[PDB]
TrEMBL record:
The chain holds residues 74 to 290 of 290 of the full protein. It comes from Mycolicibacterium smegmatis (strain ATCC 700084 / mc(2)155). One of its GO terms (cellular component) is extracellular region. The keyword Metal-binding does not apply. Pathway: Cell wall biogenesis; peptidoglycan biosynthesis; Glycan biosynthesis. Keywords: Acyltransferase, Cell membrane, Cell shape, Cell wall biogenesis/degradation, Lipoprotein, Membrane, Palmitate, Peptidoglycan synthesis, Signal, Transferase. The active site is at H174, C192. The lineage of its organism: Bacteria, Bacillati, Actinomycetota, Actinomycetes, Mycobacteriales. One of its GO terms (molecular function) is acyltransferase activity. GO terms for biological process: cell wall organization; peptidoglycan-protein cross-linking; regulation of cell shape. This is ErfK/YbiS/YcfS/YnhG family protein. The keyword Transferase applies. Residues 91-216 form the L,D-TPase catalytic domain.
Length: 217
């Protein structure tokens, strides 16, 4: 029994970051996943040069191994529905744990090399190539996410400004006034990428969902 394509992201005519994956939502939960995956056609792209995942029973996700070209129109068709979206500038944020820096560049031009503070050795910042998943003006960081009870001296529960979600695990780029004195010198966070309020606000206003974030040594 065949299945209909309900919704595709990014929406038709949307403008996203160069690392934004394609999600396809089907009308009914999918049985033959391998068939659903083969039904994805991307212009000038081979889907084997990427990775398929299934976030929900009815939604399919494809992430390219390389970034999309910036300032481009990406054309795809999944089964019947044919759509297309656009990419904006390549906005790359590189967190360097050893150097305690967060470097942001647009289309290869380095704009800012900002003092940052990554995770302390007990709670390190996970390394790899990530994607700005969400933008929240305010979010509550809860220490119970990483197994620290609020009754512990090292527990915490606080509101942070200008948060950019890096992982679904709970890694963020956010404003951390508490650690301004350590940013650029040592890593004192619980995993997040700590910036000054002005740098976090600057990065927040210029970043978009889908922009690549790289955490490295």
């Amino acid at each position: 029994t065949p299945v209909e394509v309900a919704q595709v992201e990014p929406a038709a005519g949307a403008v996203v970051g160069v690392a934004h994956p394609v999600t396809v939502r089907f009308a009914e939960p999918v049985t033959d996943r391998r068939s659903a995956e083969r039904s994805l056609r991307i212009a000038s792209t081979d889907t084997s040069a990427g990775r398929f995942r299934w976030p929900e029973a009815a939604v399919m996700e494809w992430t390219p191994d390389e970034f999309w070209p910036a300032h481009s129109t990406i054309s795809l068709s999944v089964g019947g529905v044919k759509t297309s979206f656009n990419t904006g500038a390549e906005v790359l944020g590189v967190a360097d744990i050893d150097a305690h820096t967060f470097t942001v560049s647009v289309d290869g031009e380095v704009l800012r090399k900002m003092p940052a503070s990554m995770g302390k050795p007990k709670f390190p910042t996970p390394r790899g190539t990530f994607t700005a998943l969400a933008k929240e003006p305010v979010v509550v960081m809860d220490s119970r996410t990483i197994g620290i009870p609020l009754s512990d001296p090292e527990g915490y529960k606080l509101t942070v400004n200008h948060a950019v979600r890096v992982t679904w695990g709970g890694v963020y780029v956010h404003s951390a006034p508490w650690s301004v004195g350590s940013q650029g010198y040592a890593n004192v966070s619980h995993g997040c990428i700590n910036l000054s309020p002005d740098n976090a606000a600057w990065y927040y206003d210029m970043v978009s969902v889908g922009d690549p974030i790289i955490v490295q040594a």
